[PDB]
Structure 1
Amino acid sequence: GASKLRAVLEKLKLSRDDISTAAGMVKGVVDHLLLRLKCDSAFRGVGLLNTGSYYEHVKISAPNEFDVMFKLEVPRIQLEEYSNTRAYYFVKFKPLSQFLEGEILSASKMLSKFRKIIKEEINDIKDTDVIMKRKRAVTLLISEKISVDITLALESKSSWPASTQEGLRIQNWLSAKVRKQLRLKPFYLVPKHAKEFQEETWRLSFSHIEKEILNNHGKSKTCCENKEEKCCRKDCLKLMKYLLEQLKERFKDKKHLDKFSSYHVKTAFFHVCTQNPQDSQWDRKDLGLCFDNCVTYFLQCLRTEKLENYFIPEFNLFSSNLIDKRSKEFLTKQIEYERNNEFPVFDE
């Protein structure tokens, strides 16, 4: 039974126009900020990284909340893996000379200048109302409705770090040909500190590869281009994302589900895609059965405390050090109740 699932997808489709207009406001303000940022010597090669839920056509809800990524090409860089983390690194070289705190590029000094130019650029913009919310990377408020989370990401056209070597298991699904082509693409580093925290580390980002895989997702090149070749991959991800957002909303006044994100759902989704490489395993008629494997796999990750990063196999997103067992058990309790009662949180 996919009735309640198909119902939700129709309601989610109704949010498309509001999200689209709101994205229009954000594209306006962001194109402006990038024009002003490009003036500074350090942020010369700055550009918009067209990655995220919106460009991947999976932005389910919240038109008043957008995340934007700013790429900055860095020339010949050297990475030093921090404390065997496989995801966190120090950026060494091998225009950013001003931000070097030794031989290591400072995340803090880099972000400070970024925050400084952005702060300076939002007072000069009078056309639309734009306010900047203080740091607690950079958050804007367009008109007085839309919030924009702005992330800075370094771009490296180098070969991917060794920790990714056994990641991106798309060979039997998307082909080895595609895996070779994808790994030839750059890789990003977002400033994220790691526990000790180490406020000088950078985390690996493959937002662009997630987009490529989501927007060209079948074994067949003509997947979702004809009546006979329609699949339910994207619809399963949209439903998983919506399941977490609804439960997170239902229990906001509890605080358990705070540490869970759409990235956990997306990672689990790519794992299920690897397990079911055939387009025939994703038939539109089988949506109920397909979403049930997604729910089921996700629950196994919660129980076993094992959700490996799709690109970095050794990095566990569901580690006890990141999410406490009692929180995973609450999320399990709720998802199982929902599945058992024909998803009451959907019509909610």
Structure 2
Amino acid sequence: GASKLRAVLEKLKLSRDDISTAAGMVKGVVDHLLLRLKCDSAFRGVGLLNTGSYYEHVKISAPNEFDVMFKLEVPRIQLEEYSNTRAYYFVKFNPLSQFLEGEILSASKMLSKFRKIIKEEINDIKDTDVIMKRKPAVTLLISEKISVDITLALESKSSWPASTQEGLRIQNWLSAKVRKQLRLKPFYLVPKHANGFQEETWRLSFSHIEKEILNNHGKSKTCCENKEEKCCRKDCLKLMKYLLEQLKERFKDKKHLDKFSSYHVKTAFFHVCTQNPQDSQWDRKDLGLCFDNCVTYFLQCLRTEKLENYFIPEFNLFSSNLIDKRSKEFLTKQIEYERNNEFPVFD
């Protein structure tokens, strides 16, 4: 039974043109900010990253909400793992000399200059109306409709940290050949401090690898290139993403589902892909069964309080220290009700 599922997907597809026009306004403002950012010595090598839901063709439900990534190549860096977290690091070693708070690169001083240049540049541009929202680093508001979340990410062309060594288990699905090729690619560090936090740490980012894997997702190279080879991987992720967005909208005034994000859904999705490496396990005709495995796996993670980062196996996104048991039990209660009642939150 995939009828309501196929119905949702068609409706979601109709929002494509609206998302495309809105992206036009954003491309204008962003190209301008990058031209002005490149002027400062520190942000000279700044560029547009091209990762996210939109570039992975999985952008569901919000044309008035865009997330943009700004990469900045950093030359010869040394990482120091913070408090055995496996995901959070200190950036040690130059254009960024001004932001060194000891031998360590300050996330706060770095982001303040970034926010400062952006604040200075949005007043100077009169072509379109752009406002900057108060202290996903910098948030803009274009023409009073479009919100743009701007993230700064350091780029390192070094070997991936030791914590990733046993991650990205795509060998039996996408091949070891591909895994080797992917790990040769750079890695990113976004400033994330996650009583009181360490406001000088950087978290690992592999948004570019997630895009590569999603846009070349089959065991067969010709997956989704012909009628006989069409799969439902992307559709299951779109449906999982929409399921959480809809439930998070339904209970916005409650505050339980606040700690859950589309990243939890996407992570759980990649785990299901590792479990089901065959394209035959993802047949378009089996969408109902495939979406049910995704729902089922996600619920097992919520019950067992275990959702490991796809790249950092030792990092548990569903740890009791991150998300309290009552919140996971609320999300379980809601998802189970939905599955039992042919997904009323969809229509």
TM over 0.5: yes
Alpha-carbon contact 1:76-1:94 (below 8 Å) kept: no
Question: Structure 1 residue 195: deviation in Å?
Answer: 7.1
Alpha-carbon contact 1:173-1:218 (below 8 Å) kept: yes
Question: Structure 1 residue 124: deviation in Å?
Answer: 1.1
Aligned residue runs from structure 1 range 161-180, under 5 A: 161-180=161-180
Alpha-carbon contact 2:136-2:151 (below 8 Å) kept: no
Separation in 1, partners of 2:297, 2:193: 29
Alpha-carbon contact 1:52-1:211 (below 8 Å) kept: yes
Residues 130-155 of structure 1 deviation map (CA, whole Å, 9 limit, x = unaligned): 11111191000001100001010000
Residues 67-89 of structure 1 deviation map (CA, whole Å, 9 limit, x = unaligned): 11100000000000000000000
Alpha-carbon contact 2:73-2:155 (below 8 Å) kept: yes
Structure 1: runs of 5 or more not aligned? none
Alpha-carbon contact 2:136-2:150 (below 8 Å) kept: no
Residues 19-66 of structure 1 deviation map (CA, whole Å, 9 limit, x = unaligned): 111111111111111011001000000000100000000001111111
Residues 302-336 of structure 1 deviation map (CA, whole Å, 9 limit, x = unaligned): 00000000000000000011110000000000000
Flag the 1:231–1:136 CA change in 2: closer, same or farther, 3 A.
closer
Aligned residue runs from structure 1 range 306-345, under 5 A: 306-345=306-345
Flag the 1:212–1:136 CA change in 2: closer, same or farther, 3 A.
closer
Q: Does 1:156 align with 2:122?
A: no
Alpha-carbon contact 2:64-2:147 (below 8 Å) kept: yes
Alpha-carbon contact 2:308-2:317 (below 8 Å) kept: yes
Flag the 1:195–1:168 CA change in 2: closer, same or farther, 3 A.
farther
Q: Does 1:214 align with 2:214?
A: yes
Separation in 2, partners of 1:35, 1:225: 38
Alpha-carbon contact 1:78-1:94 (below 8 Å) kept: no
Flag the 1:136–1:310 CA change in 2: closer, same or farther, 3 A.
closer
In the superposition, the TM-score normalised over structure 2's length comes to 0.99
Alpha-carbon contact 1:68-1:151 (below 8 Å) kept: yes
Residues 158-216 of structure 1 deviation map (CA, whole Å, 9 limit, x = unaligned): 00000000000000000000000000000000000037500000000000000000000
In the TM superposition, structure 1's runs of 4+ consecutive aligned residues that sit over 4 Å from their partners are: none
Identity of aligned residues (%): 99
Q: Which moved more, 1:246-255 or 1:191-200?
A: 191-200
SS at 1:344 equivalent = coil
Residues 98-127 of structure 1 deviation map (CA, whole Å, 9 limit, x = unaligned): 000000000000000000100111111111
Separation in 2, partners of 1:22, 1:276: 36
Residues 267-303 of structure 1 deviation map (CA, whole Å, 9 limit, x = unaligned): 0000000000000000000000000000000000000
Residues 235-268 of structure 1 deviation map (CA, whole Å, 9 limit, x = unaligned): 0000000000000111111110011000000000
Separation in 2, partners of 1:84, 1:331: 29
SS at 1:113 equivalent = helix
Q: Which moved more, 1:151-160 or 1:22-31?
A: 22-31
